Design a protein around this ligand. Structure first.
Ligand SMILES: CC(=O)N[C@@H]1[C@@H](O)[C@H](O)[C@@H](CO)O[C@H]1O
Ligand SMILES: *[C@@H]1O[C@H](CO)[C@@H](O)[C@H](O)[C@H]1NC(C)=O
Ligand SMILES: *[C@@H]1O[C@H](CO)[C@@H](O)[C@H](O)[C@H]1NC(C)=O
Ligand SMILES: *[C@@H]1O[C@H](CO)[C@@H](O)[C@H](O)[C@H]1NC(C)=O
Ligand SMILES: *[C@@H]1O[C@H](CO)[C@@H](O)[C@H](O)[C@H]1NC(C)=O
Ligand SMILES: *[C@@H]1O[C@H](CO)[C@@H](O)[C@H](O)[C@H]1NC(C)=O
Lengths: 226, 84, 326
């Protein structure tokens, strides 16, 4: 229930932030602005003279005989060709970046939405749990759901335990002490338990590891029998 | 042909010479980047334009020791947005 | 490499100079200069974006405790050296000395003089070397003193030997193997770090991919400057001589050719700069991914964070780039 409530609260906060002028879609507006500016510049370039006597073709034709009209028209032709070529090259360069972004988005869709990924900071900050897609004009939005630890506590720890001249290590977890007793707990969530032969394994004696302790290890079989 | 009031605050930075802003010893997050680690902002004093050296973050020292560990006791669920 | 040099050009001063007739004639060619300015400004801002996104992975500036004992591992050659004003490490100092720049665009109260006198200038980066050194030191201290927990939340301390036991267990080898061979592993790591230091200090000359950027930018600028000595079919290459020997009706004809040639040179320069900035951005993205996945965690991707089974990684800064020790 606590996790459900936290998830619902986070979704509600996202909705509230996005509703009231988030203005977070700058990356999707830059593309539109760039394309519009490019087209407007291309149209505005039509009013230049490029060293001719006039910027209007009909005026040049009207004011001059064909032999001079041709030499006056060549300059305009050259200039406008140059402008168009510049536009095309810049469009190519931008399309390259757009393709790179599309490839990244496809990989992220494959690895974050259709599965669970262990790559750090790839599907959000923290430990990845889930992800959901949404569409938007000329783009995609991923909602990444992650798990974050909190409210840490301080403990004393040892690498191994010593008992009956034997060194015991935890199968999966760490040894922790609250001041007088030793327990074994999992790393990501505090949940102490009694140390027994079931959740530890033995290898060697008590004179190789640096920093062992003398605590006891419980065995269930003997109490079970008698 | 326009002239800027040279009697106002003048500051020297590796980017060049800055006129119209007063240098302060506080450090905030960069707002308008000037360069060489110098940024500027519009702050309330009255209101005026100030220049400063941007900060990188708050200090922190981990309490390392030979046999001390920290274990979480609670968790949180985060939902974040990414745009592509 | 993460970033390259930031340059700007004064189109009117490059094409015309102090002449007024040339500027009046250039006024009739539209808005090429504005497009060139916009492109170069975009490149300049992109460089700072690259640097920030690569080196700004840490929320807070972490510190290392006064006592340096980490289970026998030294870490002396990579932690900051308080003696130096810049607070760099030994390896960082070697890297800084190995690569030589031309200029960072500071006050300029040769070749650089010619570039300046023709309207070509260089702008300084937004982050100085000291800030990048602080970022690297914070990352290294966090990695050493907290493991991988500082990249997924708040830093939680843990003794280094137990962290190494975790990392050993993460590659399919039990931790009792480490606990019983701690001194040998520490000696091997110390010897490897010393060997890296000795190789780098004894004229390794391994920083070529970082010198190539500087050389290419300088060569492009030198070519652009030397392009001013051509004629492009005109009588001469100096506008003053044309103005002195010819009447305005013919002077305009002679000046148009020079204007067109200079514009073509500028356009080709800017296009090549764009094409190079693209690949620099790709390399910066790769470097950011490596920083986020190798030093902030342990990766099972084969041959991504070094050759062999990945254990750890440490970052270092260098002029216009980063270095990883896997
Ligand atoms: C998570 C936590 O409580 N860590 C504590 C730290 O706050 C304290 O300064 C230090 C000194 O004993 O011990 C540890
Ligand atoms: C440690 O935990 C044990 C639980 O068995 C408890 O009895 C003891 O009082 C605790 N010691 C403390 C909190 O100092
Ligand atoms: C307790 O520790 C001592 C030395 O620390 C060791 O000699 C002894 O064997 C250990 N076990 C005991 C006393 O049961
Ligand atoms: C930790 O153990 C080492 C090894 O004996 C010792 O030199 C050091 O003083 C101890 N304390 C700290 C804080 O490292
Ligand atoms: C964990 O945090 C939640 C915050 O919503 C709180 O309600 C809950 O009581 C906490 N658990 C413990 C054991 O303190
Ligand atoms: C670390 O290495 C340096 C030089 O290699 C050496 O002077 C120093 O003594 C080493 N650290 C320790 C604790 O011995």
């Amino acid at each position: 229930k606590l996790i459900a409530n936290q998830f619902n609260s986070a979704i509600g906060k996202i909705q509230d932030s996005l509703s009231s002028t988030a203005s977070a879609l700058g990356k999707l507006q830059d593309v539109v602005n760039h394309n519009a500016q490019a087209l407007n510049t291309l149209v505005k370039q039509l009013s230049s003279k490029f060293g001719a006597i006039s910027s209007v073709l009909n005026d040049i034709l009207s004011r001059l005989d064909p032999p001079e009209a041709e030499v006056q028209i060549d300059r305009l032709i050259t200039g406008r060709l140059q402008s168009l070529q510049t536009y095309v090259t810049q469009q190519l360069i931008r399309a390259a970046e757009i393709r790179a972004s599309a490839n990244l988005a496809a990989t992220k869709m494959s690895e974050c939405v259709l599965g669970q990924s262990k790559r750090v900071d790839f599907c959000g900050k923290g430990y990845h749990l889930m992800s959901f897609p949404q569409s938007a004009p000329h783009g995609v939005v991923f909602l990444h759901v992650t798990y974050v630890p909190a409210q840490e506590k301080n403990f004393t720890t040892a690498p191994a335990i010593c008992h009956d001249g034997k060194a015991h290590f935890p199968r999966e977890g760490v040894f922790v002490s609250n001041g007088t007793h030793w327990f074994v707990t999992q790393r990501n969530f505090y949940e102490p338990q009694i140390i027994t032969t079931d959740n530890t394994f033995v290898s060697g004696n008590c004179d190789v590891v640096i920093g062992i302790v003398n605590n006891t290890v419980y065995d269930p079989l003997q109490p079970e029998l008698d | 042909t326009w002239r800027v009031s040279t009697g106002s605050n003048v500051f020297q930075t590796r980017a060049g010479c800055l006129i119209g802003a007063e240098y302060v010893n506080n450090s905030y997050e960069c707002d308008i980047p000037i360069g060489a680690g110098i940024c500027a902002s519009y702050q309330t004093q009255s209101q005026s334009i100030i220049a400063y050296t941007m900060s990188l973050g708050a200090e922190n020292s981990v309490a390392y020791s030979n046999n001390s560990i920290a274990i979480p006791t609670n968790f949180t669920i985060s939902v974040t947005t990414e745009i592509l | 490499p993460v970033s390259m040099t930031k340059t700007s050009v004064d189109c009117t001063m490059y094409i015309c100079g102090d002449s007024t007739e040339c500027s009046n004639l250039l006024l009739q060619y539209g808005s090429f200069c504005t497009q060139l300015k916009r492109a170069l400004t975009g490149i300049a801002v992109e460089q700072d974006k690259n640097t920030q996104e690569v080196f700004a992975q840490v929320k807070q500036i972490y510190k290392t405790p006064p006592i340096k004992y980490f289970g026998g591992f030294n870490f002396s050659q990579i932690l900051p050296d308080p003696s130096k004003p810049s607070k760099r490490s030994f390896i960082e100092d070697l890297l800084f000395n190995k690569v030589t720049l031309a200029d960072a665009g500071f006050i300029k109260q040769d070749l650089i003089c010619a570039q300046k006198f023709n309207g070509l200038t260089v702008l300084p980066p937004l982050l100085t070397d000291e800030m990048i050194a602080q970022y690297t030191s914070a990352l290294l201290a966090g990695t050493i003193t907290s493991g991988w927990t500082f990249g997924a939340g708040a830093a939680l301390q843990i003794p280094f030997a137990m962290q190494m036991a975790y990392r050993f267990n993460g590659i399919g080898v039990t931790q009792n193997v480490l606990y019983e061979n701690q001194k040998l592993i520490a000696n091997q790591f110390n010897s490897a770090i010393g060997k890296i230091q000795d190789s780098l200090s004894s004229t390794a000359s391994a920083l070529g991919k970082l010198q190539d950027v500087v050389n290419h930018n300088a060569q492009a600028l030198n070519t652009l400057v030397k392009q001013l000595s051509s004629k492009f079919g005109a009588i001469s290459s100096v506008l003053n001589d044309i103005l002195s020997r010819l009447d305005p009706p013919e002077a305009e004809v002679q000046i148009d050719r020079l204007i067109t040639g200079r514009l073509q040179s500028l356009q080709t320069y800017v296009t090549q700069q764009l094409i190079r900035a693209a690949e620099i951005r790709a390399s910066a993205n790769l470097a950011a991914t490596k920083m986020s996945e190798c030093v902030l965690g342990q990766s099972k991707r084969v041959d991504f964070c070094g050759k062999g089974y990945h254990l750890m990684s440490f970052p270092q800064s260098a002029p216009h780039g980063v270095v990883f020790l896997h």
